[PDB]
Amino acid sequence: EDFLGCLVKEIPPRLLYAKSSPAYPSVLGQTIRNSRWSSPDNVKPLYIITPTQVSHIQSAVVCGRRHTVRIRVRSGGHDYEGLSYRSLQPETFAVVDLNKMRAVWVDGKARTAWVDSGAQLGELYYAIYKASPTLAFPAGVCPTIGVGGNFAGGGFGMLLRKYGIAAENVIDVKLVDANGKLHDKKSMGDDHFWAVRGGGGESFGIVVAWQVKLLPVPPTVTIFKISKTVSEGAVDIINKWQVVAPQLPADLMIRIIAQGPKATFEAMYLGTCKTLTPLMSSKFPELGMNPSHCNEMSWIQSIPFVHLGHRDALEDDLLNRQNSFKPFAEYKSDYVYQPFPKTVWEQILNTWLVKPGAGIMIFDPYGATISATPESATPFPHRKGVLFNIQYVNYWFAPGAAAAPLSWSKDIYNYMEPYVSKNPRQAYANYRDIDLGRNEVVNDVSTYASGKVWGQKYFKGNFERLAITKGKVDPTDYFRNEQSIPPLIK
Ligand SMILES: *Cc1cc2c(nc3c(=O)[nH]c(=O)nc-3n2C[C@H](O)[C@H](O)[C@H](O)COP(=O)(O)OP(=O)(O)OC[C@H]2O[C@@H](n3cnc4c(N)ncnc43)[C@H](O)[C@@H]2O)c(*)c1C
Ligand SMILES: [Cl-]
Ligand code: NA
Ligand code: NA
Known part of the structure; x- marks a missing residue:
């Protein structure tokens, strides 16, 4: 009352x-x-x-x-x-x-922008485009994601090999802390400003707006989407990809989507077909790329093309608040540091992705810029040595039909355990997965020990600094949820 x-x-x-x-x-x-x-x-x-x-x-x-x-x-x-x-x-x-x-104010000459947290990524990208066709910002692929949550948990997309994560391209914030006080970088200090940029949402206060640096992109980028069935040699090709792709030049990102015994190699290249084609022949000829695979377009056009396969509907795809797509959904994630044996790729493509309730797997290669940042420089620790991230995505569309996909998600996570990172088994904070662990609350405060179980998975060696910072800025654990940073206080 x-x-x-x-x-x-x-x-x-x-x-x-x-x-x-x-x-x-x-x-x-x-x-x-x-x-x-x-x-x-x-x-x-x-x-x-x-x-x-x-x-x-x-x-x-x-x-x-x-x-x-x-x-x-x-x-x-x-x-x-x-x-x-x-x-x-x-x-x-x-x-x-x-x-x-949801305002987005772009200073094209200064190559900076202030973006309200309630803007969706497509609106940020589009506002950048209204200012310049050769500026970009490296955040997610999905246009309807909120800036607030995406940036707070890191944020990565098809520019991650060139420019790293969204949060490491943030140069200031406007934030309301647990006492209602308004902050910027200067008033917050190093610890709090470090934590808020990639240490997960909610925990460190409400970010009202983010100031970002805008980054150059060429006027033409090139996308391809090349599929290979297992008959077409997908296993040998992906087995090569996992070593080659993280070592490719920073201008070239080749991710993979698989949803059966077939892999689709989706590339974003900061350059033209003319230079891509010889680069592919030199570094990854096994994929069989030729100029007919090229789709040249502007950077802004690449956002709907990569996510939706659309070429022709820029405003409708980037300015979209209808919320039409509401799958029932389950998600998990992993990080890989050692190449999978060929036999594991065989099992993934021929067996795991042909099961009842089977989802989709998305593989994003790291290396280059994202991996050049030290693990502790930001809260996001998945950096040097990472070959690729895996996202396991399960969508379904009827109530009362969750059993099979939920079981598949659990079962494949168990199958993959020997081949992915361990001690801890790393996961991306923005691919939130409550089955990694949840907090216990004692005397109305999330406990450090319960937080550490899942916290080391998202944040590895950065978890303790996050918790000490939490203790300084929010000792009574006001801003929390079931998987937020607990305070570690004297
Ligand atoms: C649905 C969806 C998610 C995606 C997609 N693709 C992604 C991609 O290409 N790259 C990514 O890095 N991530 C992708 N994700 C995952 C999203 O990044 C996460 O799901 C984000 O956390 C979503 O952010 P948002 O849409 O803002 O979600 P909320 O539920 O509002 O908040 C998440 C989390 O953060 C806290 N929080 C929200 N807002 C704030 C502010 N302003 N300050 C602090 N903390 C905030 C919330 O309390 C909550 O805990 C593609 C698709 C389709
Ligand atoms: Cl999430
Ligand atoms: Na490890
Ligand atoms: Na879940």
Whole structure:
């Protein structure tokens, strides 16, 4: 009662929603991306606040502290476990939903931009394009991802070999901490500014906006998508790829998508067909690339082309808030440091991807710029020595049909254990997977020991620094979820 009373004193009431508010279901559902988490059995927020000004965010946090109601912040809603808008067990929380804070102000001459966390990536990319056809920013492939969550957890895409992760190209932030105080880089200090850029969402406060450096791209880039079935020699070709691709020049990223006994090699090249073709002949002739495979286009056009296969619908693909695609979805991830034996590739393609409930596997090669950053320089530790990341993606589209895909996801993770990173088995924070472990709360604070179990998987040797920083900026563990950094205090 008095939490709401506090909010109503400080925030326009049209931006406040209780469970009985007629628009509450629509507002709650607007950026839910996973049909597992939209159904009535999920734990719902007591209130939703949709700020349009930073002062609204500050007021909400101050009210939450005064009346001990915790807040889950949502930007784009893509959290794989829905932790921006649901809790796993019954508890009281509010959602602060930033979708109305979505400005992107680009300074093309300075090659910088300020981007509100509630902007979607496609809107950031498009605003960059409205300023210049030869600037880019290296974040995700999916246009509807929120800036807030993507950057907080790192953020990587088809420019990762050239420019690393989104978070290491952030030059300032505007942030509201657990006491409602407004911060920038200067006021935050080294530890807090280090942590917020890749240490995961929620834990380190609400980022209102991010200042980014914009990076050059040529006026023409080249994409190809070359498929090889196992009959066409996919196993020998991917067995070669895992060694070659992480060693290719920084201008060339060749990822793989597999969803059966067939691998599709998808390349983004910062250059022309004219120079790509000989580069392929020299470094990876086994793929059989020729100029007919080239698709030359602008960098901005590559975003819908890589993700959707579209060539012709730039604004519709990048400016999209309809939320039409809502699979039931499960996700896992791994990092690989040693080449798979050929027999493992055989099993993946011929056996694991031909099972009931089998998902899709996406393989992103590292090396070059992402791997040149030291493991501790940012919270994102998956750097030197990484050959590739794996994402295991399971989509399905009917309720009551989760058993088979959930079992496959578990079973293939077990099969892969001997071949991927270990001690710890590394995972990407933004591919959130609650089965890696969850927090225990004791005396209303997430425990360090419970956090460490999953925390070392996402953050390796950076976990303890993250937790000490958490202890300094949020000792009472106000901003938390079931898999957020616990405070480690004296
Ligand atoms: C759905 C989806 C996700 C993708 C896709 N492709 C990706 C890619 O090409 N590269 C990537 O690096 N990641 C990709 N992912 C995963 C996403 O990056 C993650 O799912 C992001 O965490 C999503 O961010 P967002 O859409 O903003 O999700 P939310 O659920 O709102 O938040 C996630 C997490 O972070 C906290 N949080 C949100 N907003 C803030 C702010 N402003 N400050 C601090 N913390 C914040 C939330 O509380 C929650 O814990 C492709 C697709 C289709
Ligand atoms: Cl996620
Ligand atoms: Na290891
Ligand atoms: Na999951």
